[PDB]
Nucleic acid binder design. Structure first.
Ligand SMILES: [Fe+3]
Ligand SMILES: [Fe+3]
Lengths: 445, 439, 439, 417
RNA sequence: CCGGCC
RNA sequence: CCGACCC
């Protein structure tokens, strides 16, 4: 058979029934109610896109890029099973994300359970394993040509990376897929070369749903790629006559990152929503496997509970009558009545990074908030927003050149902000005083 | 204060006066953030996830632009501030009363569950606006900026709903001199209005429909003339071509919105699930009152807290009674969807006895001629009547030179998708069509 | 006075009365009858664009680029005296092109007068000087704030460069403007960075008239350009987020110069037109001032005669019944019946370049073409077309002072027979390759 | 031989049959390379430098595509390769009769020069095609590739102009059952043809105007049906908006380009130059006869060399007799043009003496008037789906108001207001 | 304004 | 595969 899904950004995205069966399942539709770009919802009016369009675009792009590379280089005779595994990994382009999208593994789960080491690529891999084990797809994976012993290892390594921690520079620590298909591990999720379909898809989707000028045209980049050996190792490389397209892509990436993903009021609302969701973690719970009340913070330990972790929790604070949920609803109401936290002051740290994960960030900030730097009163619960998170690409090899044409490498960490809302004018003066104190205190920022 | 500005993908920068901001900054208006215009179409159309907040902002912007263009083009209208504020407030209501899942709630859900209650979203918008004004103290601000609530609010409600009440000016908020301002946003007569234009533009932007319509030119070329006997806002320029392609795209995406096959079944399933879950989810009102799922329309204080979230309130529900109901929602998350048993074409139907339409369907589908078994309540019949181009186009008269040139499907989707029952369903559909009235 | 010109590429081109006075002269309408691609029209049916629109576009682009630099960087004191002066330099950057553009000085003049060195930039300078002295342009130059004694020298240096040859590396060899305006010599005629308005405009025009994809957009480059000091001097630099745009521009340049300016049949037709002019050089007289009869080749020595030397001469040979022009006319007729000189072979030797300009090129090629390279007989009527005519030199700003980040093709042509000519062409290509420094 | 391909900015690749190539690569067809499409409109639109050569190639391509699509779609019409080649040849040779500056030569010049002869450029196209066939030896090739000259040539000529001669099928090139092939290229009745599509597309390409009509879709949705009594080509699908946009494009092109005031003034000045230089320009025809500019239409040997070059051949002329003519050309060099004197609304040969009546009314208004009188009047629907301009020769600023008043008085007195 | 449709 | 070479 053959299914096809219409998406506005990548047009017609064609899928095969294994990919659909993984896709059209309860543990992916949860994404339909978690916005990919969360904190702009009350800042950028049009940025209401959900994870569905982002995942669809990533799947379409990965399929096109792996189908072009193999018709324009039919010397290795790759197998459909590998592409299916890569597509499964790609459909986890943002899968692990929970409420408020990237916040869940960005600023929610690490902030609430500081001792827990969890990342959303590993979470996506585990959720995919749960989907396989619950939805009964493995027998039909072996029926329709996939071997879990090697295909599952390949897909898991594509999704997460090096599963183990072997320390050997002159070795390939990836036994999931044989090196005769090494280039296949730079198509769906690559963090070193930077040629990944995810960035393309989410740049195009964010531009389409925000009305910003996106010039990049991935069709030419996909259509002009071949596998070439660079330095005793094989990498997928594009042609010389595309460097302007990738410059446009990089400028689109930077424009999207600096307009939205670090917006002032966007980050302020992100911080307020994240704090309100976090502070109610234990007493507004969902039930997982075995009926255990494994709360939102602890829901990372089980996938059955982790399924029901969506943006609804936000609303579940806004429309709740319980006395314990009072504070959350109150704060949300102050968000609705335009009593937002107005923000003033910014810095960037140069002294390596913080010691703790996020706990000590607030306490030192509150401490340094007060100082005798020449209004009245004083406070301690004032916010501290810490955001942590020229194409440097050498995959320009030419197909005609067997192992050359690198074009001489194409020729050539945290932002902290404050917010004071004591009074109409008193808050501005207090914010200036605190900005002075914190600046003189933030490790000589 | 002064103008605020909000960026939208459709109309770019939308500049609003302080009164419009005060209207926008309300819980009863920010509730619209979780109301998708295309609603259920999301489960079959990926990108159509826009919300009612931008739709309201866009309708307010379009109405302000229209009134400003009319004022600049025709100084003889003598536009004042009361008209501008009232028109903006009425414009920002282009879906104001819409509840959970918008047109699904009143087009298919509320009328199906309890046919005895009159539910139209314009009256709900009027009640919600009244609650907003009363709670938020809007009347003092309206006095503060010079507009008169006693007539502007009545005019806004009439524009939101229609006739205020002997075929002599049913609207009692404005005299006969402002005969064109009442069709800037709603325009129940002609069928082309700023609400439809703006939401067409936004739907085509977020759905992949190719919209060739340029609304700015139409706005810039508006003058007030006489059509038959009274004043009517007529398009000064000859935009017949543009509006031809406009109605083409309108039919394209209007019929795209009324989805077929998968979309219709998904919508019906969602509705039926809400109807089953009505008893197992409670909504709190004002004064401690608890109104059931369907009866929450009678109080605007409680209706302010009615958004799509009720959907989620079943998806996160654990009370045992809703169990079955929750499963039906699950039935659209996973791909085990039911197939539709056909469609047919036909006034004989109103807001009464529609809830028994499947029963008559059950009269023909079960126990059909030469048919054995396969009989149940599988009928989930859908009636979508709801509410060339044949455009009506409704300094000294005689210039309005007009140029030269129904029932929806009887769709009964079978709740049970059994493969064995497929042949029985085909036979039942043939018998039903050839028996009742249709083909 | 304020003129506006509609161009397909640049839209509305605004000009001021000095530019109009220069334009509406006999020595500019001469450009209107000279093909941009002389031998490209007999290959591309759309390439009928003339040098007139190209000059208009180049002048407009130069004016825009010098007008932006001074509004977004008002430290170099750019005045109305400078913008018009530049625009004039751009508008006359090709004023001296002869019949069939680059052919006239590319292959004709070296064949006709090998002892005289001629380039169409010198022709532009001489034609502009004649225009100034004859059309009374000095009074209106002085009327609109210009000093002809220095402005004419500045424009002439803009067209060609250093009028004199001073022996000093560390010197400013221009008498037009001091080094405080060095950037002004990087707008119309650039030899190092390759970013000049001339190339932009003629690339855009060739793309419009050849159906090629034009990715470069000069509007963004203009809007994001500033003057920056690189090596003790001022140079025009773009923004960092434009390197893809300039890569697209360079690839457009390469594609245009490998499709059209190196086209096989285009160059063959260029050679045929050149031969027809040569055979008719002695029998065609043009009369200037004083009745003096200057031939086609010698008309470069008088501008009054050189004005009336356009592409019409081609037709003036074709529609001629004079027996002495017979041979020339014959060749032109062979162009119409498409009896072109068939060509086989294209080699480039590694032994530097050709010694003479055009005379010794033909004779040695024909002579060496015959050898016992393992048909029969021999001939000497074989032409030899030798055409001579990567992003590091382009500098751009780094952020918001910033600095930069971190040749002879020879072809032949034999038109003997369908098979004999091919064999002889292969034999001659073998012989020339084995003889011309083991080419 | 083999199929040829020509690159055009409008239609991309244009594939031609070898017979079409043999027809094209002839002097009487390559003559179109030096005849401007818009003609005098070029001196008003610097980008409109396209010629009739690419227009003819494009019209041939469009007609071939349309006929091939009709043949493939509906086999009951029994369209063969002979019909396709004949339609293509009629497409390529539908404007061979155009003279210098295209429509100016017969719309403005011929009626003044020779009012006793009725001359339309379609007849010139027919005569030029006949001369092309006879001189270039096309008939052996037409016989070689399956065409039958005795009737195929008559069919092509009929497609160019129409009936050579009881209201019963006047055409004699093909039977009455193929009544739709006669309106693919010319289409005098319906008014939509490949010629109009191609020259609209090219005008919009070279003028900056927007082109909304996609001809490929219309071709792909074309079927032959019956409206009243006979077979007629029509758009089977409802491309009504596309056709309305095409007609809007037609109206815009006609209003802006073909009716520009300065364009008409340029045409009038070139026309006056030709009328003055008629007696003193000799063109060698066939048999050594010398045909004037006006009398070169009677012999195709002289008419082959009658192109826009004669313009330049007056501009650079040194004979004293041509002096006056050259001087009038000199005016365009300095943009000295006739000024506007007003507009008014109501055969070209009868209007040859028009200015005299203008001199009858402009003089002694409520000779200088005769001198300044340069009057050049130059004066969806039925589709199956699913003004006077007296250019003022005297450009005197003081006399401008008097000339305007005289023209107004003349118009408001004689027959108009 | 004689190469604008403001 | 001489008005193209890969649109
Ligand atoms: Fe140039
Ligand atoms: Fe024509």
């Amino acid at each position: 058979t053959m299914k096809v899904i219409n998406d506005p950004i990548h047009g017609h995205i064609e899928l095969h029934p294994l990919l659909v069966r993984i896709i059209d399942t309860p543990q992916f539709q949860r994404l339909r109610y978690i916005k990919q770009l969360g904190g702009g919802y009350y800042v950028f009016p049009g940025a209401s896109h959900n994870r569905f369009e982002h995942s669809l675009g990533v799947g379409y792009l990965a399929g096109c890029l792996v189908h072009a590379l193999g018709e324009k280089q039919p010397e290795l005779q790759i197998s459909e099973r590998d592409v299916l595994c890569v597509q499964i990994a790609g459909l986890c382009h943002d899968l692990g994300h929970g409420p408020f999208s990237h916040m869940f593994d960005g600023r929610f789960i690490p902030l609430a359970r500081p001792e827990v080491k969890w990342t959303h690529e590993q979470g996506s891999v585990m959720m995919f394993e749960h989907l396989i084990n619950s939805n009964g797809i493995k027998p039909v994976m072996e029926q329709y040509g996939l071997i879990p012993e090697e295909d599952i290892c390949f897909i898991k390594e594509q999704i997460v990376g090096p599963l183990e921690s072997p320390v050997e520079d002159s070795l390939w620590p990836y036994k999931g897929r044989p090196e005769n298909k090494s280039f296949l591990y730079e198509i769906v999720s690559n963090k070193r070369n930077g040629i990944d379909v995810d960035k393309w898809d989410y740049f195009a989707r964010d531009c389409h749903h925000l009305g910003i000028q996106n010039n990049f045209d991935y069709k030419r980049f996909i259509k002009f790629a071949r596998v070439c050996e660079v330095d005793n190792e094989l990498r997928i490389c594009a042609r010389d006559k595309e460097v302007g397209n990738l410059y446009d892509m990089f400028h689109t990436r930077n424009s999207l990152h600096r307009r939205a993903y670090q917006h002032k009021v966007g980050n302020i609302i992100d911080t307020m929503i994240t704090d309100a969701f976090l502070k109610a973690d234990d007493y507004i719970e969902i039930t997982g496997a075995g009926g255990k009340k494994y709360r939102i913070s602890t829901a990372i330990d089980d996938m059955e509970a982790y399924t029901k972790l969506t943006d609804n929790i936000f609303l579940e604070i806004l429309y709740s009558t319980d006395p314990k949920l009072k504070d959350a609803r109150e704060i949300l109401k102050q968000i609705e009545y335009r009593n937002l936290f107005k923000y003033v002051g910014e810095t960037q740290p140069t002294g390596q990074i913080k010691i703790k994960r996020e706990d000590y960030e607030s306490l030192p900030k509150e401490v340094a908030s007060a100082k005798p730097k020449v209004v009245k009163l004083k406070a301690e619960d004032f916010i501290v927003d810490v955001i942590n998170m020229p194409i440097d690409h050498v995959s320009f090899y030419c197909k005609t050149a067997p192992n050359r044409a690198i074009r001489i490498t194409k020729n050539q960490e945290q932002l902290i902000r404050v917010y004071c809302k004591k009074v109409d004018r008193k808050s501005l003066y207090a914010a200036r005083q605190y900005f002075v104190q914190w600046c003189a205190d933030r490790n000589f920022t």
